[PDB]
């Protein structure tokens, strides 16, 4: 990366610290990767983390020169999921094909499938994007997560 944006990338990492001690954990790593510009699969992270469990995931520390090879290794990244894949991805539960699903199934599938969400993760994401029948149209929900 350019020392221009790498200066900025450093700052956001430093603003992730808890104390000042220079050490953002194997946990928060995922948010730093995000906040710089990424949307990693929690797997993409786990890959460069070195496969820890909750214990050393919480206990092991990172510093920036331990992080920057990670952020770099992802970034020029394999395949980035288009609008088209994603809509069909949510389209899955449209019992007929309609373009629409009930906001209850949609709140739930994200809390049961793939990289599972909490209710907190879902409600903020989905709410106010169901209509006056309680259907979330998926097409716009997909666009919403894109341009965000």
């Amino acid at each position: 990366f350019s020392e221009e944006q790498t200066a900025e990338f450093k700052e956001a990492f430093q603003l992730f610290d808890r104390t000042g001690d220079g050490k953002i954990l194997y946990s928060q790593c995922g948010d730093v990767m995000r906040a710089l510009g990424q949307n990693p699969t929690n797997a993409e992270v786990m890959k460069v983390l070195g496969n820890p469990k909750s214990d050393e995931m919480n206990l092991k520390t990172l510093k920036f020169e331990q992080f920057l090879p990670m952020m770099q290794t992802i970034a020029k990244n394999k395949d980035q999921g288009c609008f088209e894949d994603y809509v069909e991805g949510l389209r899955v539960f449209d019992k007929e094909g309609n373009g629409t699903v009930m906001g209850a199934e949609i709140r739930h599938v994200l809390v049961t499938l793939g990289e599972k969400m909490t209710e907190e993760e879902v409600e903020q994401l989905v709410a106010g994007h169901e209509d006056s029948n309680g259907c979330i149209n998926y097409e716009e929900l997909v666009r919403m997560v894109l341009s965000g």
Binding site: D94, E96, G97, N98, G99
Partner: protein
């Protein structure tokens, strides 16, 4: 007024009636597309015996 017109009457019954395979139709009713599902939600009228 403007001329004696000939009408022919063969097939008029089923023209003022409109019958169809109610089966495929009730599935056109349960369709995916907004158009087809709006267009065919009127299944009740089709006659089967």
């Amino acid at each position: 007024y403007a001329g004696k017109v000939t009408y022919n009457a063969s097939a008029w019954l089923t023209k003022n009636m409109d019958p169809l395979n109610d089966n495929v139709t009730s599935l056109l009713n349960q369709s995916s597309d907004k158009f087809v599902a709006d267009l065919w939600k009127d299944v009740d009228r089709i006659v089967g015996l």
